[PDB]
Structure 1
Amino acid sequence: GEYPTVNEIPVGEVRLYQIADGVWSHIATQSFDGAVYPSNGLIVRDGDELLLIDTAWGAKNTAALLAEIEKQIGLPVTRAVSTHFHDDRVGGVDVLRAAGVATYASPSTRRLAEAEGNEIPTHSLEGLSSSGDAVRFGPVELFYPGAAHSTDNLVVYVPSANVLYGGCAVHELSSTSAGNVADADLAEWPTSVERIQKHYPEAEVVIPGHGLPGGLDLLQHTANVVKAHKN
C-alpha cells in the first residue's frame, strides 16, 4: 500500500523502494502518446557496489536516479543491464556511461536499439539467445524466457531474496490492457510466461515493468491480459 503511484511522482523525479535486503526498485514517470506512465527498474547490492537493472526512462530521470541512489544508498553504481531495447530501458544509457557505469545488454537488444535509434548499451551479453537461456551476472541471474512484450525481453532473478524482476514482459495485477504491443509476440507470450513460472517457482516478489509489485500471480495474470488483448 506504500509503493509510489504515477500521480505521486512528477516527471523528472525518481523514487526508490526497498524490496528486500540489498534490493530496491526505482520508480520514475514519463510520457507516451501524451499520457504519463510510471516505470520500474531494479537496484541490487553487489558487495560494496550496485548493479542497476534498466534506466529510469530518459536522460533527466536517469540523472535523478543516480542522485537518489547517492543520497539513499551511497554505494556506486558500477554496472547496468537493460532488459529490452525500448526507451524506458535504454533511454539514459548515455547518462550512465558518462557517470562511469558500464552498460550491458544482449546482442538482440543492442541490434534492436540500434535499429530503433535508441541509445545502445556498450557491452554485449552472449549466452541469452535461445529461450530458457540463463547467465549469472554479479548478484543476479539473467533469463531469456522467449518472445513476449518484445523479442529480446529479459527477466532478472535475485536468488538471495527470491525477487523476480519481470520487466515489461510482466504486467501488474490491476492491468486490464496489454500496453504497447507493437513489438510483442502475443502468441508466444503465454509460453514465455510458462517458462518463467517453471524456472522461478520460489519467487516471493514479482516486479512488473510498470506498476505495483506483487507475488507469483502477476505471471498468470499477464498471460490472461495478453489473451484478452489477442481476442
Structure 2
Amino acid sequence: LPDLKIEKLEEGVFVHTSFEEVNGWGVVTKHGLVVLVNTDAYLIDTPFTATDTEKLVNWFVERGYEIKGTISSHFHSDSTGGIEWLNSQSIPTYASELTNELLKKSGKVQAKYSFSEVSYWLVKNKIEVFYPGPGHTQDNLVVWLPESKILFGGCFIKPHGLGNLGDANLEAWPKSAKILMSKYGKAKLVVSSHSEKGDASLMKRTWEQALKGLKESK
C-alpha cells in the first residue's frame, strides 16, 4: 500500500493523499486538504486510518503549527477514519448535524462540534463549509477557501463516474450539483476525493454524470 503523501498546492494549502484497500474498488486514493491560518492548521477530511491521521498531524505540529480543527465532508470512512483518534488527542472535530446523526446510526464515533447552517464559516473569511444538498450521500459537504479560490468537493465531485452508490441520492444529486455550480463559478481549482485537481469545469462534469446516473435509475 502506498505511503501517506503531503504536497503543498499553494501558500497555506496542502493536499494529503492516503490509500486503503476496499473490497471491489481495490486500492482507493483519498485526497484531503490542510489549510493554514497564521500558526493554526485545519484538516479538511482525515486519512482512512488513525495511523495516517497521526502522521498527518505530526507533519504540521513538527513545522510549528497547532491543529485548531478538523472538518469531515461526509460520514463515510474516507472523511471520518481519524475522528476517534483526533478526539483522544484533544483536537476539535467538526461535522454537520446530519453527518453526526449518520455516524451515530452507523455505531461510529461522532465529531465533538456540529452545525446545522447551510453555509458555516469554520474560520471567518478563510474556510467556508457549504451543504449543496444530497448527492453522494445525504450529508455531503464541500469546503471553500475564498483567498485561494479553491473548492474541496470531497466524494461529491465525480467527473468520470459516481462511484459507490450505497448511500447516494440519485434524484437530488443533479439539483445539488447545479447549486454548487451556481455558488462557486469563480473557483480556480476543484479538489475532489478520488480524482486529479481540475478547474471549475469539474462541477459541470459532476452534473453531467449525476444526470446520467439518474436516467439509468428509471
Question: Given residue 215 of structure 1, which amino acid in structure 2 is its aligned partner?
Answer: D
- CA RMSD, Structure 1 to Structure 2 (Å): 1.5
Matching of residue 145 in structure 1 with residue 135 in structure 2: no
Percent of pairs with identical residues: 30
Residue aligning to 1:160: 147
Residue aligning to 1:188: 172
* Structure-2 separation of matches of 1:126 and 1:145: 13
Residue aligning to 2:96: 106
In structure 1, which of residues 59, 68, 80 is the aligned counterpart of residue 70 of structure 2? 80
Q: Structure 2: any 5+ residue segments left out of the alignment? A: none
1:169-184 equivalent positions in 2, closer than 5 A: 169-171=156-158, 173=159, 175=160, 177-184=161-168
Residue deviations 1:84-123, cap 9 Å, x none?
1111111111211222210011110001011112221111
Instruction: For residue 186 of structure 1, report the CA deviation from its aligned partner.
Output: 1.1
Matching of residue 38 in structure 1 with residue 29 in structure 2: yes
Contact map agreement 2:32 2:47 (CA 8 A) in 1: yes
In structure 1, which of residues 104, 110, 134 is the aligned counterpart of residue 119 of structure 2? 134
Say how many residue pairs are matched: 212
4+ long deviations beyond 4 Å: none
Relative to the length of structure 2, the TM-score reads: 0.91
Q: State the secondary structure of the residue aligned to 1:165.
A: strand
* Structure-2 separation of matches of 1:146 and 1:118: 23
Matching of residue 61 in structure 1 with residue 52 in structure 2: yes
Q: State the secondary structure of the residue aligned to 1:203.
A: coil
Instruction: For residue 22 of structure 1, report the CA deviation from its aligned partner.
Output: 0.7
Contact map agreement 1:93 1:119 (CA 8 A) in 2: yes
Instruction: For residue 76 of structure 1, report the CA deviation from its aligned partner.
Output: 1.6
* Structure-2 separation of matches of 1:164 and 1:148: 16
1:91-102 equivalent positions in 2, closer than 5 A: 91-102=81-92
Q: State the secondary structure of the residue aligned to 1:109.
A: helix
Question: Given residue 151 of structure 1, which amino acid in structure 2 is its aligned partner?
Answer: Q
